[model samples]
Target chain A: GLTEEQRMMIRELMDAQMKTFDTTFSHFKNFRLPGAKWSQVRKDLCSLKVSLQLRGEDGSVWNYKPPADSGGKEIFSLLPHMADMSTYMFKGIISFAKVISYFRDLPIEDQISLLKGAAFELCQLRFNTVFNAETGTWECGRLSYCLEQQLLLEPMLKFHYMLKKLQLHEEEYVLMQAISLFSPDRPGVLQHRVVDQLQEQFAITLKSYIECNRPQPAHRFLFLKIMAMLTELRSINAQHTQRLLRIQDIHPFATPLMQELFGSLTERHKILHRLLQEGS
Target chain B: GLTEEQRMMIRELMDAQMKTFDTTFSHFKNFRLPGVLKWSQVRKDLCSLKVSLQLRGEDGSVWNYKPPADKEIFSLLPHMADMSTYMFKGIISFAKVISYFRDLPIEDQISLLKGAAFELCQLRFNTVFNAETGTWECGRLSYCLEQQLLLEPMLKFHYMLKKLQLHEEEYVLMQAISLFSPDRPGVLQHRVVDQLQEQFAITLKSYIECNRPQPAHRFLFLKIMAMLTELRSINAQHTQRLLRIQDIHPFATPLMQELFGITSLTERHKILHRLLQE
Candidate 1:
């Protein structure tokens, strides 16, 4: 009936002004108390770093060193670069534990779920820290990335550019990583409320920090944009996994962790879930 | 093949010198420029956007709006929030474009189109993507960030693809490649579809090889095909995402529910088969 059109118009008119249910600002106010949990959270986040620095003859340089000779005539030449990057990726996984040792207290199932979900996005955040926007290269230690690898790194570089344009601070990076880690929506998460609360605390902290430090008018949108970036990270990681899976068809990953992470989306959770169970 | 100790040794050496990469400055000079394409190609690509510029507005600043307050979040729902309906309509027209698509047995066509439906929806949406402001402008029923919900990856893919600045024909061939897949779960005439898909893929390959400059040609085919993988991941994750969207939108159309298999999977192929037969 035409009433359907009338109803949609009414719905649009009724939805004109919206009210947010967020108590994030209220929680942020509580966190502003001297020497509160936010302070500790900030410290823990800052201290936890996936450092991607390599020592050059002169001093320090970005970690990634592309292979010296670059014929790259065949597709497999890209594998060594991927292999090198996977090592740092493992470091990204290990470093997640230091900040969120609280996760260890959760049910082992939920803990594994969080790791399986957030691990790839966290690595992207860590890697972005080393991304040199000038020459469009990742400073992944001594292993220099050749230009051919740039094709693979293209989306990553675009993401890094967005972060660079935002001038994302280290504090912001870690807090965003934490927010991403505590995501309640991952497939297997059992303790949704606890994870949601944990994420909210960090989200409040991030908003508070953005307000205090980033005083520019433009900074108002920065928090939401940064949050939106977590969604983008999932997409990038999805592509990365897809690209890696295709690579695996020809050049199978030799490393156990690499196999587990990029083996296939289903296998990663299944394998990692069991491994975390056995290892602990 | 490596033992745990050996793996540890390898990992240790890899991680040793790695500290962190810090961006020394905020201002990125010309960071958004096309990364791989030649200057001439970029120029040519920009000239071809004459129509898009007019349709969405030249500034592309028209799409931005205040995000809906948490209460009225549904207002931010896209005008074509019924992607299930949009995709079905698109799939029907899409069938008309490919030569052999309609000639195939109805079962094969249904299988091919259904498998590729959401992916094709994304590819179609890419036609109207406005990268400068990350909203997909589907003319009147434009989509903003909140409306996109979990489909944010599509926006990223759009941004990545818009950078490549593929020609119009290249984009169409890509859509054909995505459509004619032989490997979708229920494909019956696999050999026939395989040949068709191969023809489209290498047709794209040959076109790029002929048209693109030598430097760009080197990785262009690989990069473009890799983009298809990006779409596969997007398509793979989309069913779950539509389910996630149902929580937000609540009253999804019955058509959407049926197509996404969200409400009930009962007789899904039956509906699809009937629709393709239409």
Candidate 2:
């Protein structure tokens, strides 16, 4: 069994390394629209002067420069969009897998319960990044089916769109995912206290994370801002719950966790919180 | 005029800088997009960043005017593309600094990114190089565009920029915002980056309105976005050379990709629109 300190260290290291290492965009930094590799390794900056001089001697690049004159302007095309999506989707799934080993270390029953409980919620948060708030169009960064266009995503779309409208920075996405991932409140979990402690670390990390990134006034209530987003997600979750129940009437395909999320919210924690609740 | 060794040395230095500076996205990647500093130093920074390739009248006699250092070598050996890619590897230190770019939907980012650095670099040349006077001063080296060639398109672009009469602040702001394009194919968040741009646009406008005070001041500023579109369209034309250049030599690095102007200028055709209002 991994000790509490080990779990905390794991999360601390994960938090520190989160944005710099694998997530999605950072891993495949060189992927082209055609889904081929754009390989390069990092070295040093001393050569910038060297290259600038070389770039200059090559040619006075601008003159006779033809305007793309596609007539005017056009956005994206379908084929390249697919090409981009195919690569991103694969890379993203691979990046998400980094945390799987962390989960495999937890107690099987507790792990299974929490994994199922957190899986769809985590999926929602991760997929929401695909939105293109520019036009409120649903597409992965460049995806068609690659980005947006989902049926079950109705309320979540509105929720994330509202987050984009709120105009927070990208750093928040990593912290928010961390917050969601470490949530201790999911149904049928044994390590509530330990998980709750991990969630607290994330909350603190997110606060400092935003403050460090935005220094003018230092973003006083960004943790509160995150709550503002979750507040919207909470309401949307209820709406989603209500709709899923409507679907459940005809088909009834809810997973235990999905059912907990959509069924009686109180029903999920009867035994999970039996020891902690006021009257289990 | 640098010695070949110095040029190679400078290139080595530049590659190192590229890795750290995220020059692929250039300086705008960190911005969602805008910022602050000594408050007094912005114009200096902007002006420093604004330099472009110095075009000379008889600079190369059009042929050598075209080839100072003749890169046909880049074409003669396709195997060297990988070697050249390593040689110029730091050319695109883009997303490393600018998380805003990385924040875009992965697919959308890659889609636009196919041409983002190259397109931006081309526009970077045009923005920093004052077309009216044919001069540019980007940090270490500054060059005057040779007035000799005097082509129709160059004259139009230069005159167009001249008529706009953009000051350092206006030109700097316009150049930075143009780089974060949200409307490219696969981008759903064009509106968001658009909003980010508007925030800077208004900020720039208000700063300009304080100085220029004409009701038309902001109007002219907004109109500059159209000029940027022209710059990008120009990039498409430059990309024409790249498709063929790449065919022969093949760019193996992200930096090499843009060095020849390998942009995704070939994307969607139907929604064509232009920004050069009037």
Candidate 3:
């Protein structure tokens, strides 16, 4: 593992990326014209490089290397697009965590409040990113590819795996996984073998992360935080599982996990009943 | 109390009336033309002397006195009108009972059924007296001043009373009561009382007869029959309730019940737990 200073640096980088993403998402909402299609946004990104530079590091000169023919437009285009992708991915993670947080040993009312808050936050983020005043339609933009693949797609696949290994409520976990998996891609795993592989890898990574991050002292407060993180991880796994399941020729291992996830969910119903009684 | 022999006669009369009413109702169903409103069947009862004779009693001619002009037609018109009035009255009783029978206890179901049958039979007997069928509408022909004031009005009033008394399921009972109470004539108890006292002593007589009828055990069979009936009744009640709630003047009591009956807050908590478990 990394030293404390190194970990802190990583955290700061992550936090900076998150803050940029949040600000970028808000900008998308503010400038979103009605009927603005994704293609138009991509085209606009080329022209709006000047306005975008202020938000960039080292201003316009920083990372200004574009293709020979395209000048610096292509290079500048990549930054916002990548940011969009990061935002979408992070949002998905945040949402999954929010749901999982409720299931932790908190009061039922608190859980509900947290879930509502998370849902509201998600809607707000989404609205900011996609709201177009000029065109009512939400354009996925150039960021869509990255968001769809990296942010949404990869995280969801990982979430599904985490759900199975963690023995979370199977149906809920599977359902969450399925929705995320299917949300970004169609006939998902079948349409792209790469997506299938990525999803598989995501699951493995998520499981490993959880195993490594397991808390030593499961205190209620700490446990909640851990649970929140686990929820985030599980959400990613569920998303991937969903994507794989949608494919016609799903890998046998993925299918069993799906089934296992559902079965485990049914088993956890007793725990839910007990939780309800305790909550009341 | 009447002697046993007198009681038997009354029972026989009631039973015969019921049988006759059943036959007439069946005939109405059998003869019903496609796309015909139910009112048409009632209309057919008028304007046919031969048809009237078929429906009336064997000894009805004893009461039939010919009027001076077209004596055969004119003379029997009054009696025929009376008979038609009786038949119409019988129909109303059965219809009302059919509407309300869903909620009654088993004993009440049997009593109502028997009562409906008896009234129908009596109407048939009255129809035999006047063989002349006029062009009068079924309502006018069947419900004469005396019969309307007497048998028709009284049975209808009682039917309404029974509907109110036996309605158990709160939503359904309230709906039925509301429908029966408004706009429909003879539904309001006070209105019925005025008609009974002024137009016909027969109303008083019928009321006494209803009270005097031998008490029958209505509870035992009602549960099973009511269960079967509840499906239809509940569906109707739900539909009616939905409409009533939407309407501006929808009955207040039902609205209150519906609001309180929604899934509770506790249930929402359970749902969340269940979702997590899933």
Candidate 4:
């Protein structure tokens, strides 16, 4: 059984992690892309780099360390595994927000390749676990490791590829794309045009990939895995954000970062929805 | 998604099925091995049977009929598949209980064999569907079916075999056994023992044949199946009987039968305990 104190601690840790990820990711987003002078993007990335370093330190606030003694180790070991299996999406969303923010700041060509690499890396990491033959269950060594490896990586990669194809540099194109994908009231500040273009481009890429190979059952497995990870992440982020807001006391600045991360993650829903629609 | 009426209907159907199985199983237990029966065992088995049946039916009740129209047929077909997947131990238990009751008045040799046959049949039936795969999470279905096929059947079969091996006439053996495993507390009359022994012998013979081995796994499967079923039935029956007695029910007849079954099962436990002690 989970104690109230333990639950509260988890809530706090998640809140801090979300805030850290959002702040770092948004800093990356503020940098100019390919059309902007290379020196300007580099300058922004350098200033963002300082904040990113600070954010990395802040993210450590979410890490749990068990106390010395066998009992403590036994009990605390359970949390990491659960966190890995259960909290990946909520945590990953925060990490992805940082990635998205960083990608937005980079040159267009670099962003696309970075995104593709990120997507594949995440997929490989997440799926590289032993499947229980008898139980037919996945057993992750630590829940955090699973999230870091699997859930966060792939989507960020895909988003980058989509951004590159759409040539999403201009503010108007990005804003309009984001709006079309997500409602105006939706959280985060990705441009509507950029989002729409990404969706269209990803669909085309996915279609060509499928067409190049004959339809097979194995493809269905890959599709289901991707979809399941995305859905789980979305669900975790929504719940985690709501829990954070309910906390009685928190630093004012931290609250905004939390809000920013939540908003950005919420915006990603539109992208996911479009991807799923195309996949179907 | 399940409606209140639907849940209640399911509950009632389960209660009815449980009551039938409990009464019949208890009646047969009067011929069980050992002495000093208790009320607890009967209650445990009965409760286990009820919950297992409910879960089995939850997946789908086996009763499906054809509809007149294509529209109805098409709509019902998927529902049937869903229900069949649900059909597990409770359905098998239902078949076994009905089968056992059908052989009640037969000669001792035949009755013994029939009881054994039903036990083996239950194992075979359960193994065929493999409720283990279906209810792996809860382990309730596996537990319940194991009780019916394994614990109850093996106990009855062994008791009959022991009597036959001793070369005691069916009437004499049933009488001696009934002294300890009386169906009713009203003193085991000589005439009643005579009838019970004859019936017991018949059931014993039936079981020996029904449980014959082909591949070695069949025997192992039967044993494994019984072990799991007993675990559930014993715990469940105990819990249910405890709850039922607490409830202000007026059905004394059923209550008495429940008490008798518990006594019979527990008496066997004591005998085994003493045998081990020696």
DockQ of each: 0.01, 0.06, 0.00, 0.00
User: What is the clash tally of candidate 2?
Assistant: 53
TM-score preference between candidates 1 and 3, better one: 1
Q: Write the per-residue lDDT of candidate 3 for residues B32-149, one digit (tens) a residue.
A: 1111002333222222222221122222211111121111222233343334334544443433443233343333323222223223333233332222332122321122211332
Ranking by TM-score: 1, 2, 4, 3
Could you tell me the lDDT of residue B35 within candidate 1?
9
Looking at candidate 1, what is the lDDT of residue A211?
Answer: 72
- Tell me the docking grade of candidate 3: incorrect
**lDDT per residue (tens digit) for residues B112-160 in model 1:** 7767877767766676676766565555334444233223565568778
Native contacts, share recovered per candidate: 0.00, 0.13, 0.00, 0.00
- Structural similarity to truth (TM-score) of each candidate: 0.36, 0.30, 0.19, 0.23
TM-score top scorer: 1
TM-score of chain B of each: 0.66, 0.49, 0.19, 0.24
Look at candidate 3 and tell me the lDDT of residue B213. Answer: 38
Q: Where's the lowest-lDDT run of ten residues in candidate 2 chain A?
A: A40-49
Candidate 1 vs 2: which has more lDDT: 1
Which numbered prediction scores highest in DockQ against the true structure?
A: 2
When 2 and 3 are scored with lDDT, the better candidate is 2
> How do the residues A80-188 of candidate 1 rate in per-residue lDDT, one tens digit apiece?
4456455445443544443344455777667767776777787777667766677655664443332323333356556777887787876677677777878899868
Query: Which stretch of 10 consecutive residues in model 3 chain A shows the poorest summed lDDT?
Result: A53-62
Determine which window of 10 residues in candidate 2 chain B has minimal summed lDDT: B269-278
lDDT of 4 by residue, B1-278 (tens): 33464344334434435543322122221111111003455444433332122111222211111122111112222322232222322332432343222343323222222123223322222322333332211221221221453345434333323322322122222222222222322332435544543444443333333444445334432343244345334434444543455343322232223332333333433432222223
Model 4 chain A worst lDDT window (10 residues): A48-57
Clashes of each: 24, 53, 45, 52
